[PDB]
Amino acid sequence: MKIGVFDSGVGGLSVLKSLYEARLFDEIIYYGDTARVPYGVKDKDTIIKFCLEALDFFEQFQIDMLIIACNTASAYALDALRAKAHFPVYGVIDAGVEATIKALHDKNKEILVIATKATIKSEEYQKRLLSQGYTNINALATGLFVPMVEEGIFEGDFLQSAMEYYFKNITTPDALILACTHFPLLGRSLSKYFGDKTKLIHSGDAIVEFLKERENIDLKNHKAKLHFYASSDVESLKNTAKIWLNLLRK
Ligand SMILES: N[C@H](CCC(=O)O)C(=O)O
Ligand SMILES: [Ca+2]
Ligand SMILES: [Cl-]
């Protein structure tokens, strides 16, 4: 089982970590479009175009399956990606919704979706939740979280002001969907901001359960062999990857 993992840049490592630790695969190819990141503040057409180029890049690897780690790309490009690919392609949005339903199991509970501008604008989360009868939803772009995470700001007064700027006079949700690859890095601060009543829905953990229910995968004895590629400064991606996944252990 050799799969591909696509993200707009470095943030998708949160999803990779999930897939890595779940021990589902022999081998994983991670590609980050670091030369053109972010996607979240750009337009639909551009996002779809960039995703198709990524699929082109993965053509050289003989992968059995492609996971779109990026929520933004998952929001707009799945249709095109699936029309072109001849192997299963999965995004994280569908998975995120069902993990939310599984966490709450009560259509009356309150849900907050936080993501990039483009992901929110797609209304893809909203659409899936509503169709399942979950109508107590709020969707909110919190875009500054991405470059803050990338600058290594995961807590403190700077981040507090960021949350208060985004979360002023909004209600505390029974669940918040971390609908952005970067957001698990802010998991503790977010949870501290909202309190323990709010369940955090993690996209990476979500896609893992999603695959386990959809596929028949034996749990591996050994960790997958990881491969890192990037459109720019691949060593920087690898450096970040080493820190976030801790690829320095035994
Ligand atoms: N990877 C993107 C966040 C960074 C970007 O804007 O490209 C996402 O999950 O939505
Ligand atoms: Ca197909
Ligand atoms: Cl889509």
Side-chain angles (χ1 to χ4, degrees):
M1 254 297 173
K2 182 191 308 205
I3 70 163
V5 162
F6 173 66
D7 181 70
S8 62
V10 89
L13 296 174
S14 62
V15 172
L16 184 57
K17 187 176 189 292
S18 291
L19 304 164
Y20 190 58
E21 294 173 352
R23 301 190 163 191
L24 312 178
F25 312 107
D26 287 343
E27 182 172 343
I28 309 179
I29 315 288
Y30 184 96
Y31 180 63
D33 190 11
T34 55
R36 301 186 296 204
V37 80
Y39 285 11
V41 293
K42 286 149 191 183
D43 68 282
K44 174 184 177 70
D45 289 348
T46 298
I47 287 155
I48 296 180
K49 182 172 64 174
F50 285 175
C51 286
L52 290 180
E53 297 186 17
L55 184 60
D56 194 346
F57 176 87
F58 276 105
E59 292 183 338
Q60 68 182 269
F61 287 116
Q62 306 189 262
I63 58 173
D64 307 328
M65 168 168 56
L66 178 61
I67 306 291
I68 309 307
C70 178
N71 303 78
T72 292
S74 288
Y76 296 99
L78 275 200
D79 294 350
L81 287 169
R82 289 176 181 177
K84 181 59 181 175
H86 291 129
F87 44 75
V89 180
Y90 291 107
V92 290
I93 297 192
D94 206 345
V97 170
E98 70 173 40
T100 302
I101 293 174
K102 284 153 80 171
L104 296 178
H105 52 266
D106 184 350
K107 71 182 195 172
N108 300 307
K109 295 299 177 209
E110 171 176 335
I111 293 178
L112 174 71
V113 186
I114 56 170
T116 61
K117 280 188 62 175
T119 298
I120 293 304
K121 178 182 186 181
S122 76
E123 298 169 7
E124 291 285 333
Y125 280 93
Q126 299 90 312
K127 279 193 292 290
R128 291 185 164 274
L129 290 161
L130 290 177
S131 74
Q132 278 304 314
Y134 283 71
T135 61
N136 304 122
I137 323 177
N138 294 119
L140 189 50
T142 55
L144 288 188
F145 287 169
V146 165
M148 285 176 101
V149 164
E150 301 205 15
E151 212 151 311
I153 301 170
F154 309 133
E155 67 164 52
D157 294 19
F158 195 5
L159 190 66
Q160 293 299 322
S161 294
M163 289 183 303
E164 195 49 60
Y165 168 81
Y166 288 123
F167 305 139
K168 60 201 161 200
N169 297 295
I170 82 123
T171 51
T172 315
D174 304 288
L176 90 170
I177 299 175
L178 307 180
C180 177
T181 57
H182 286 61
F183 294 8
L185 283 301
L186 305 179
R188 174 187 157 278
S189 294
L190 287 175
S191 187
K192 286 223 303 180
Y193 183 87
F194 286 107
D196 260 340
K197 102 146 192 171
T198 295
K199 165 94 203 302
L200 280 61
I201 309 295
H202 186 288
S203 288
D205 295 338
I207 184 55
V208 166
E209 297 311 298
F210 179 94
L211 284 155
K212 284 151 72 68
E213 181 167 356
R214 229 116 317 198
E215 300 297 275
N216 202 40
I217 334 177
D218 308 335
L219 285 2
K220 323 252 77 168
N221 186 42
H222 48 72
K223 301 302 224 194
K225 183 178 56 165
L226 297 186
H227 291 312
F228 298 96
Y229 295 87
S231 47
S232 118
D233 204 337
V234 70
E235 293 303 318
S236 285
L237 173 65
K238 294 181 183 180
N239 285 8
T240 300
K242 264 52 167 286
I243 300 180
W244 291 9
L245 275 59
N246 246 266
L247 282 344
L248 37 125
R249 166 51 60 87
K250 297 165 76 66

PDB file of all heavy atoms in Angstrom, residues 111-145:
ATOM      1  N   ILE A 111     -22.442  23.721  16.213  1.00  0.00           N
ATOM      2  CA  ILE A 111     -21.228  23.439  15.473  1.00  0.00           C
ATOM      3  C   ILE A 111     -20.600  24.713  14.934  1.00  0.00           C
ATOM      4  O   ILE A 111     -21.285  25.562  14.366  1.00  0.00           O
ATOM      5  CB  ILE A 111     -21.527  22.493  14.287  1.00  0.00           C
ATOM      6  CG1 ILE A 111     -21.947  21.115  14.814  1.00  0.00           C
ATOM      7  CG2 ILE A 111     -20.324  22.380  13.362  1.00  0.00           C
ATOM      8  CD1 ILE A 111     -22.312  20.123  13.733  1.00  0.00           C
ATOM      9  N   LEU A 112     -19.304  24.855  15.113  1.00  0.00           N
ATOM     10  CA  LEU A 112     -18.581  25.943  14.507  1.00  0.00           C
ATOM     11  C   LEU A 112     -17.524  25.414  13.562  1.00  0.00           C
ATOM     12  O   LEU A 112     -16.714  24.614  13.938  1.00  0.00           O
ATOM     13  CB  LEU A 112     -17.961  26.836  15.559  1.00  0.00           C
ATOM     14  CG  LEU A 112     -17.059  27.933  15.038  1.00  0.00           C
ATOM     15  CD1 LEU A 112     -17.830  29.020  14.337  1.00  0.00           C
ATOM     16  CD2 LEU A 112     -16.269  28.545  16.165  1.00  0.00           C
ATOM     17  N   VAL A 113     -17.547  25.885  12.335  1.00  0.00           N
ATOM     18  CA  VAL A 113     -16.545  25.514  11.348  1.00  0.00           C
ATOM     19  C   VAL A 113     -15.572  26.672  11.184  1.00  0.00           C
ATOM     20  O   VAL A 113     -15.980  27.779  10.850  1.00  0.00           O
ATOM     21  CB  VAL A 113     -17.171  25.211   9.971  1.00  0.00           C
ATOM     22  CG1 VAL A 113     -16.105  24.694   9.009  1.00  0.00           C
ATOM     23  CG2 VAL A 113     -18.323  24.220  10.096  1.00  0.00           C
ATOM     24  N   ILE A 114     -14.292  26.425  11.429  1.00  0.00           N
ATOM     25  CA  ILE A 114     -13.265  27.424  11.152  1.00  0.00           C
ATOM     26  C   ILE A 114     -12.307  26.909  10.081  1.00  0.00           C
ATOM     27  O   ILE A 114     -11.880  25.752  10.105  1.00  0.00           O
ATOM     28  CB  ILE A 114     -12.487  27.842  12.419  1.00  0.00           C
ATOM     29  CG1 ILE A 114     -11.867  26.622  13.103  1.00  0.00           C
ATOM     30  CG2 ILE A 114     -13.402  28.568  13.402  1.00  0.00           C
ATOM     31  CD1 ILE A 114     -10.891  26.999  14.211  1.00  0.00           C
ATOM     32  N   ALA A 115     -11.977  27.779   9.139  1.00  0.00           N
ATOM     33  CA  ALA A 115     -11.206  27.385   7.969  1.00  0.00           C
ATOM     34  C   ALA A 115     -10.671  28.637   7.303  1.00  0.00           C
ATOM     35  O   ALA A 115     -10.774  29.727   7.868  1.00  0.00           O
ATOM     36  CB  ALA A 115     -12.091  26.605   6.998  1.00  0.00           C
ATOM     37  N   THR A 116     -10.096  28.478   6.114  1.00  0.00           N
ATOM     38  CA  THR A 116      -9.685  29.614   5.300  1.00  0.00           C
ATOM     39  C   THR A 116     -10.919  30.254   4.675  1.00  0.00           C
ATOM     40  O   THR A 116     -12.002  29.656   4.674  1.00  0.00           O
ATOM     41  CB  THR A 116      -8.738  29.190   4.152  1.00  0.00           C
ATOM     42  OG1 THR A 116      -9.407  28.265   3.281  1.00  0.00           O
ATOM     43  CG2 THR A 116      -7.466  28.543   4.696  1.00  0.00           C
ATOM     44  N   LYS A 117     -10.748  31.461   4.142  1.00  0.00           N
ATOM     45  CA  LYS A 117     -11.804  32.135   3.391  1.00  0.00           C
ATOM     46  C   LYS A 117     -12.381  31.246   2.292  1.00  0.00           C
ATOM     47  O   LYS A 117     -13.600  31.110   2.174  1.00  0.00           O
ATOM     48  CB  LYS A 117     -11.292  33.446   2.768  1.00  0.00           C
ATOM     49  CG  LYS A 117     -11.226  34.626   3.736  1.00  0.00           C
ATOM     50  CD  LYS A 117     -10.894  35.938   3.023  1.00  0.00           C
ATOM     51  CE  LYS A 117     -11.961  36.312   1.999  1.00  0.00           C
ATOM     52  NZ  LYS A 117     -11.723  37.657   1.384  1.00  0.00           N
ATOM     53  N   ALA A 118     -11.511  30.646   1.484  1.00  0.00           N
ATOM     54  CA  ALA A 118     -11.990  29.863   0.343  1.00  0.00           C
ATOM     55  C   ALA A 118     -12.796  28.633   0.781  1.00  0.00           C
ATOM     56  O   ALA A 118     -13.800  28.296   0.162  1.00  0.00           O
ATOM     57  CB  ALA A 118     -10.837  29.466  -0.570  1.00  0.00           C
ATOM     58  N   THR A 119     -12.367  27.980   1.858  1.00  0.00           N
ATOM     59  CA  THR A 119     -13.067  26.795   2.346  1.00  0.00           C
ATOM     60  C   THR A 119     -14.458  27.167   2.856  1.00  0.00           C
ATOM     61  O   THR A 119     -15.440  26.488   2.557  1.00  0.00           O
ATOM     62  CB  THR A 119     -12.280  26.068   3.459  1.00  0.00           C
ATOM     63  OG1 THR A 119     -11.023  25.613   2.949  1.00  0.00           O
ATOM     64  CG2 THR A 119     -13.065  24.867   3.978  1.00  0.00           C
ATOM     65  N   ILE A 120     -14.536  28.254   3.615  1.00  0.00           N
ATOM     66  CA  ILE A 120     -15.810  28.727   4.143  1.00  0.00           C
ATOM     67  C   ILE A 120     -16.746  29.091   2.998  1.00  0.00           C
ATOM     68  O   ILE A 120     -17.909  28.684   2.972  1.00  0.00           O
ATOM     69  CB  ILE A 120     -15.618  29.955   5.061  1.00  0.00           C
ATOM     70  CG1 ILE A 120     -14.860  29.562   6.327  1.00  0.00           C
ATOM     71  CG2 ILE A 120     -16.955  30.577   5.422  1.00  0.00           C
ATOM     72  CD1 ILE A 120     -15.514  28.425   7.109  1.00  0.00           C
ATOM     73  N   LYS A 121     -16.208  29.836   2.040  1.00  0.00           N
ATOM     74  CA  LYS A 121     -16.976  30.338   0.909  1.00  0.00           C
ATOM     75  C   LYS A 121     -17.557  29.203   0.060  1.00  0.00           C
ATOM     76  O   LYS A 121     -18.627  29.351  -0.534  1.00  0.00           O
ATOM     77  CB  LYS A 121     -16.097  31.261   0.060  1.00  0.00           C
ATOM     78  CG  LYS A 121     -16.767  31.827  -1.182  1.00  0.00           C
ATOM     79  CD  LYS A 121     -15.780  32.686  -1.963  1.00  0.00           C
ATOM     80  CE  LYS A 121     -16.445  33.394  -3.131  1.00  0.00           C
ATOM     81  NZ  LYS A 121     -15.460  34.214  -3.888  1.00  0.00           N
ATOM     82  N   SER A 122     -16.857  28.071   0.013  1.00  0.00           N
ATOM     83  CA  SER A 122     -17.320  26.914  -0.752  1.00  0.00           C
ATOM     84  C   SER A 122     -18.636  26.371  -0.189  1.00  0.00           C
ATOM     85  O   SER A 122     -19.411  25.739  -0.914  1.00  0.00           O
ATOM     86  CB  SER A 122     -16.265  25.800  -0.739  1.00  0.00           C
ATOM     87  OG  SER A 122     -16.260  25.114   0.507  1.00  0.00           O
ATOM     88  N   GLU A 123     -18.871  26.619   1.101  1.00  0.00           N
ATOM     89  CA  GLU A 123     -20.052  26.118   1.815  1.00  0.00           C
ATOM     90  C   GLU A 123     -20.144  24.591   1.814  1.00  0.00           C
ATOM     91  O   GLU A 123     -21.230  24.031   1.989  1.00  0.00           O
ATOM     92  CB  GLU A 123     -21.351  26.716   1.246  1.00  0.00           C
ATOM     93  CG  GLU A 123     -21.475  28.223   1.356  1.00  0.00           C
ATOM     94  CD  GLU A 123     -22.634  28.775   0.542  1.00  0.00           C
ATOM     95  OE1 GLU A 123     -23.420  27.974  -0.005  1.00  0.00           O
ATOM     96  OE2 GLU A 123     -22.754  30.014   0.452  1.00  0.00           O
ATOM     97  N   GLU A 124     -19.012  23.922   1.604  1.00  0.00           N
ATOM     98  CA  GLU A 124     -19.009  22.465   1.515  1.00  0.00           C
ATOM     99  C   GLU A 124     -19.297  21.796   2.863  1.00  0.00           C
ATOM    100  O   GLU A 124     -20.042  20.829   2.915  1.00  0.00           O
ATOM    101  CB  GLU A 124     -17.711  21.946   0.893  1.00  0.00           C
ATOM    102  CG  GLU A 124     -17.568  22.278  -0.599  1.00  0.00           C
ATOM    103  CD  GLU A 124     -18.444  21.407  -1.487  1.00  0.00           C
ATOM    104  OE1 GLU A 124     -18.751  20.267  -1.084  1.00  0.00           O
ATOM    105  OE2 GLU A 124     -18.821  21.857  -2.591  1.00  0.00           O
ATOM    106  N   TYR A 125     -18.735  22.324   3.948  1.00  0.00           N
ATOM    107  CA  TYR A 125     -19.052  21.822   5.282  1.00  0.00           C
ATOM    108  C   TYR A 125     -20.514  22.069   5.620  1.00  0.00           C
ATOM    109  O   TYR A 125     -21.232  21.143   6.019  1.00  0.00           O
ATOM    110  CB  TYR A 125     -18.148  22.459   6.343  1.00  0.00           C
ATOM    111  CG  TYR A 125     -16.777  21.827   6.428  1.00  0.00           C
ATOM    112  CD1 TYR A 125     -15.706  22.345   5.710  1.00  0.00           C
ATOM    113  CD2 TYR A 125     -16.558  20.702   7.215  1.00  0.00           C
ATOM    114  CE1 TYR A 125     -14.455  21.765   5.778  1.00  0.00           C
ATOM    115  CE2 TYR A 125     -15.309  20.117   7.292  1.00  0.00           C
ATOM    116  CZ  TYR A 125     -14.259  20.650   6.574  1.00  0.00           C
ATOM    117  OH  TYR A 125     -13.011  20.067   6.652  1.00  0.00           O
ATOM    118  N   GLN A 126     -20.944  23.319   5.460  1.00  0.00           N
ATOM    119  CA  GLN A 126     -22.330  23.715   5.701  1.00  0.00           C
ATOM    120  C   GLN A 126     -23.294  22.800   4.948  1.00  0.00           C
ATOM    121  O   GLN A 126     -24.262  22.294   5.519  1.00  0.00           O
ATOM    122  CB  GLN A 126     -22.567  25.169   5.260  1.00  0.00           C
ATOM    123  CG  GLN A 126     -21.743  26.237   5.980  1.00  0.00           C
ATOM    124  CD  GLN A 126     -20.403  26.524   5.300  1.00  0.00           C
ATOM    125  OE1 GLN A 126     -19.656  25.606   4.958  1.00  0.00           O
ATOM    126  NE2 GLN A 126     -20.101  27.805   5.100  1.00  0.00           N
ATOM    127  N   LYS A 127     -23.018  22.583   3.665  1.00  0.00           N
ATOM    128  CA  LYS A 127     -23.891  21.764   2.831  1.00  0.00           C
ATOM    129  C   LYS A 127     -24.085  20.334   3.341  1.00  0.00           C
ATOM    130  O   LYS A 127     -25.212  19.831   3.357  1.00  0.00           O
ATOM    131  CB  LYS A 127     -23.427  21.769   1.370  1.00  0.00           C
ATOM    132  CG  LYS A 127     -23.872  23.011   0.598  1.00  0.00           C
ATOM    133  CD  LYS A 127     -23.678  22.847  -0.903  1.00  0.00           C
ATOM    134  CE  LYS A 127     -22.203  22.785  -1.277  1.00  0.00           C
ATOM    135  NZ  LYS A 127     -21.526  24.099  -1.091  1.00  0.00           N
ATOM    136  N   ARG A 128     -22.998  19.698   3.764  1.00  0.00           N
ATOM    137  CA  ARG A 128     -23.051  18.316   4.235  1.00  0.00           C
ATOM    138  C   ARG A 128     -23.758  18.185   5.584  1.00  0.00           C
ATOM    139  O   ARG A 128     -24.537  17.262   5.796  1.00  0.00           O
ATOM    140  CB  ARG A 128     -21.644  17.722   4.313  1.00  0.00           C
ATOM    141  CG  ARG A 128     -20.986  17.505   2.955  1.00  0.00           C
ATOM    142  CD  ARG A 128     -19.642  16.789   3.088  1.00  0.00           C
ATOM    143  NE  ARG A 128     -19.191  16.256   1.805  1.00  0.00           N
ATOM    144  CZ  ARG A 128     -19.545  15.066   1.327  1.00  0.00           C
ATOM    145  NH1 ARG A 128     -20.352  14.280   2.027  1.00  0.00           N
ATOM    146  NH2 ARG A 128     -19.091  14.660   0.148  1.00  0.00           N
ATOM    147  N   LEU A 129     -23.479  19.114   6.492  1.00  0.00           N
ATOM    148  CA  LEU A 129     -24.091  19.109   7.817  1.00  0.00           C
ATOM    149  C   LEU A 129     -25.600  19.336   7.763  1.00  0.00           C
ATOM    150  O   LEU A 129     -26.370  18.615   8.408  1.00  0.00           O
ATOM    151  CB  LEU A 129     -23.406  20.145   8.717  1.00  0.00           C
ATOM    152  CG  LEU A 129     -21.965  19.759   9.109  1.00  0.00           C
ATOM    153  CD1 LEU A 129     -21.161  20.955   9.599  1.00  0.00           C
ATOM    154  CD2 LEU A 129     -21.951  18.641  10.156  1.00  0.00           C
ATOM    155  N   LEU A 130     -26.014  20.330   6.980  1.00  0.00           N
ATOM    156  CA  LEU A 130     -27.416  20.646   6.820  1.00  0.00           C
ATOM    157  C   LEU A 130     -28.174  19.449   6.268  1.00  0.00           C
ATOM    158  O   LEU A 130     -29.261  19.129   6.742  1.00  0.00           O
ATOM    159  CB  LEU A 130     -27.603  21.866   5.898  1.00  0.00           C
ATOM    160  CG  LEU A 130     -27.168  23.230   6.449  1.00  0.00           C
ATOM    161  CD1 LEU A 130     -27.346  24.327   5.404  1.00  0.00           C
ATOM    162  CD2 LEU A 130     -27.929  23.575   7.722  1.00  0.00           C
ATOM    163  N   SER A 131     -27.600  18.781   5.271  1.00  0.00           N
ATOM    164  CA  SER A 131     -28.266  17.633   4.661  1.00  0.00           C
ATOM    165  C   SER A 131     -28.476  16.501   5.676  1.00  0.00           C
ATOM    166  O   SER A 131     -29.373  15.673   5.516  1.00  0.00           O
ATOM    167  CB  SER A 131     -27.480  17.120   3.455  1.00  0.00           C
ATOM    168  OG  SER A 131     -26.311  16.436   3.877  1.00  0.00           O
ATOM    169  N   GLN A 132     -27.651  16.472   6.718  1.00  0.00           N
ATOM    170  CA  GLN A 132     -27.795  15.463   7.767  1.00  0.00           C
ATOM    171  C   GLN A 132     -28.662  15.950   8.931  1.00  0.00           C
ATOM    172  O   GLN A 132     -28.802  15.265   9.940  1.00  0.00           O
ATOM    173  CB  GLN A 132     -26.425  14.997   8.263  1.00  0.00           C
ATOM    174  CG  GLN A 132     -25.787  13.945   7.366  1.00  0.00           C
ATOM    175  CD  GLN A 132     -26.683  12.737   7.191  1.00  0.00           C
ATOM    176  OE1 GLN A 132     -27.246  12.222   8.162  1.00  0.00           O
ATOM    177  NE2 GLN A 132     -26.840  12.290   5.951  1.00  0.00           N
ATOM    178  N   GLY A 133     -29.236  17.139   8.787  1.00  0.00           N
ATOM    179  CA  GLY A 133     -30.146  17.665   9.791  1.00  0.00           C
ATOM    180  C   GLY A 133     -29.471  18.514  10.852  1.00  0.00           C
ATOM    181  O   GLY A 133     -30.116  18.968  11.795  1.00  0.00           O
ATOM    182  N   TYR A 134     -28.165  18.720  10.709  1.00  0.00           N
ATOM    183  CA  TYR A 134     -27.431  19.573  11.633  1.00  0.00           C
ATOM    184  C   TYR A 134     -27.553  21.030  11.193  1.00  0.00           C
ATOM    185  O   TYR A 134     -26.848  21.483  10.292  1.00  0.00           O
ATOM    186  CB  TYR A 134     -25.969  19.139  11.712  1.00  0.00           C
ATOM    187  CG  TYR A 134     -25.759  17.895  12.557  1.00  0.00           C
ATOM    188  CD1 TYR A 134     -26.183  16.645  12.109  1.00  0.00           C
ATOM    189  CD2 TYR A 134     -25.146  17.971  13.804  1.00  0.00           C
ATOM    190  CE1 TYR A 134     -25.998  15.505  12.883  1.00  0.00           C
ATOM    191  CE2 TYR A 134     -24.950  16.837  14.580  1.00  0.00           C
ATOM    192  CZ  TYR A 134     -25.380  15.610  14.116  1.00  0.00           C
ATOM    193  OH  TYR A 134     -25.195  14.487  14.881  1.00  0.00           O
ATOM    194  N   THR A 135     -28.462  21.758  11.831  1.00  0.00           N
ATOM    195  CA  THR A 135     -28.798  23.103  11.381  1.00  0.00           C
ATOM    196  C   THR A 135     -28.248  24.202  12.284  1.00  0.00           C
ATOM    197  O   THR A 135     -28.272  25.377  11.920  1.00  0.00           O
ATOM    198  CB  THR A 135     -30.319  23.276  11.233  1.00  0.00           C
ATOM    199  OG1 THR A 135     -30.956  23.074  12.500  1.00  0.00           O
ATOM    200  CG2 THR A 135     -30.865  22.268  10.239  1.00  0.00           C
ATOM    201  N   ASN A 136     -27.752  23.822  13.457  1.00  0.00           N
ATOM    202  CA  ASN A 136     -27.191  24.801  14.381  1.00  0.00           C
ATOM    203  C   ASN A 136     -25.706  24.979  14.106  1.00  0.00           C
ATOM    204  O   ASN A 136     -24.865  24.612  14.922  1.00  0.00           O
ATOM    205  CB  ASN A 136     -27.439  24.387  15.831  1.00  0.00           C
ATOM    206  CG  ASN A 136     -28.912  24.168  16.126  1.00  0.00           C
ATOM    207  OD1 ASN A 136     -29.317  23.087  16.550  1.00  0.00           O
ATOM    208  ND2 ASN A 136     -29.724  25.194  15.890  1.00  0.00           N
ATOM    209  N   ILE A 137     -25.406  25.553  12.940  1.00  0.00           N
ATOM    210  CA  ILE A 137     -24.042  25.689  12.451  1.00  0.00           C
ATOM    211  C   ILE A 137     -23.631  27.150  12.385  1.00  0.00           C
ATOM    212  O   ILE A 137     -24.464  28.030  12.180  1.00  0.00           O
ATOM    213  CB  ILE A 137     -23.909  25.166  11.003  1.00  0.00           C
ATOM    214  CG1 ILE A 137     -24.773  23.932  10.768  1.00  0.00           C
ATOM    215  CG2 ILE A 137     -22.447  24.887  10.642  1.00  0.00           C
ATOM    216  CD1 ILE A 137     -24.701  23.447   9.339  1.00  0.00           C
ATOM    217  N   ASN A 138     -22.336  27.397  12.543  1.00  0.00           N
ATOM    218  CA  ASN A 138     -21.758  28.680  12.192  1.00  0.00           C
ATOM    219  C   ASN A 138     -20.443  28.406  11.474  1.00  0.00           C
ATOM    220  O   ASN A 138     -19.717  27.471  11.827  1.00  0.00           O
ATOM    221  CB  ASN A 138     -21.558  29.561  13.428  1.00  0.00           C
ATOM    222  CG  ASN A 138     -22.876  29.973  14.066  1.00  0.00           C
ATOM    223  OD1 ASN A 138     -23.149  29.655  15.224  1.00  0.00           O
ATOM    224  ND2 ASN A 138     -23.703  30.681  13.305  1.00  0.00           N
ATOM    225  N   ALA A 139     -20.163  29.187  10.439  1.00  0.00           N
ATOM    226  CA  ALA A 139     -18.961  29.001   9.648  1.00  0.00           C
ATOM    227  C   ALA A 139     -18.184  30.305   9.659  1.00  0.00           C
ATOM    228  O   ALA A 139     -18.751  31.376   9.450  1.00  0.00           O
ATOM    229  CB  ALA A 139     -19.318  28.598   8.236  1.00  0.00           C
ATOM    230  N   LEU A 140     -16.879  30.214   9.881  1.00  0.00           N
ATOM    231  CA  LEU A 140     -16.088  31.404  10.134  1.00  0.00           C
ATOM    232  C   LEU A 140     -14.691  31.258   9.551  1.00  0.00           C
ATOM    233  O   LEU A 140     -13.981  30.305   9.852  1.00  0.00           O
ATOM    234  CB  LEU A 140     -16.019  31.646  11.644  1.00  0.00           C
ATOM    235  CG  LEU A 140     -15.419  32.931  12.205  1.00  0.00           C
ATOM    236  CD1 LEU A 140     -16.013  34.155  11.516  1.00  0.00           C
ATOM    237  CD2 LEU A 140     -15.682  32.977  13.705  1.00  0.00           C
ATOM    238  N   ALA A 141     -14.305  32.198   8.702  1.00  0.00           N
ATOM    239  CA  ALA A 141     -12.940  32.229   8.198  1.00  0.00           C
ATOM    240  C   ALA A 141     -12.051  32.798   9.292  1.00  0.00           C
ATOM    241  O   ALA A 141     -12.377  33.814   9.901  1.00  0.00           O
ATOM    242  CB  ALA A 141     -12.852  33.082   6.939  1.00  0.00           C
ATOM    243  N   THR A 142     -10.944  32.121   9.562  1.00  0.00           N
ATOM    244  CA  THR A 142      -9.974  32.594  10.530  1.00  0.00           C
ATOM    245  C   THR A 142      -8.611  32.463   9.874  1.00  0.00           C
ATOM    246  O   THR A 142      -7.798  31.638  10.275  1.00  0.00           O
ATOM    247  CB  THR A 142     -10.017  31.758  11.818  1.00  0.00           C
ATOM    248  OG1 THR A 142      -9.830  30.375  11.498  1.00  0.00           O
ATOM    249  CG2 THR A 142     -11.356  31.923  12.526  1.00  0.00           C
ATOM    250  N   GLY A 143      -8.374  33.283   8.853  1.00  0.00           N
ATOM    251  CA  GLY A 143      -7.251  33.079   7.952  1.00  0.00           C
ATOM    252  C   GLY A 143      -5.879  33.351   8.531  1.00  0.00           C
ATOM    253  O   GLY A 143      -4.886  32.749   8.112  1.00  0.00           O
ATOM    254  N   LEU A 144      -5.813  34.252   9.504  1.00  0.00           N
ATOM    255  CA  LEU A 144      -4.527  34.647  10.047  1.00  0.00           C
ATOM    256  C   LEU A 144      -3.882  33.530  10.845  1.00  0.00           C
ATOM    257  O   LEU A 144      -2.676  33.550  11.078  1.00  0.00           O
ATOM    258  CB  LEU A 144      -4.638  35.934  10.864  1.00  0.00           C
ATOM    259  CG  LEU A 144      -4.853  37.157   9.967  1.00  0.00           C
ATOM    260  CD1 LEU A 144      -4.775  38.412  10.776  1.00  0.00           C
ATOM    261  CD2 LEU A 144      -3.836  37.192   8.837  1.00  0.00           C
ATOM    262  N   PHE A 145      -4.687  32.545  11.238  1.00  0.00           N
ATOM    263  CA  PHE A 145      -4.168  31.368  11.936  1.00  0.00           C
ATOM    264  C   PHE A 145      -3.099  30.634  11.125  1.00  0.00           C
ATOM    265  O   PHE A 145      -2.155  30.095  11.691  1.00  0.00           O
ATOM    266  CB  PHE A 145      -5.301  30.400  12.286  1.00  0.00           C
ATOM    267  CG  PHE A 145      -6.183  30.869  13.411  1.00  0.00           C
ATOM    268  CD1 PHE A 145      -7.374  30.214  13.692  1.00  0.00           C
ATOM    269  CD2 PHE A 145      -5.826  31.960  14.187  1.00  0.00           C
ATOM    270  CE1 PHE A 145      -8.191  30.642  14.724  1.00  0.00           C
ATOM    271  CE2 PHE A 145      -6.640  32.393  15.218  1.00  0.00           C
ATOM    272  CZ  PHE A 145      -7.826  31.732  15.487  1.00  0.00           C
TER     273      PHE A 145
END
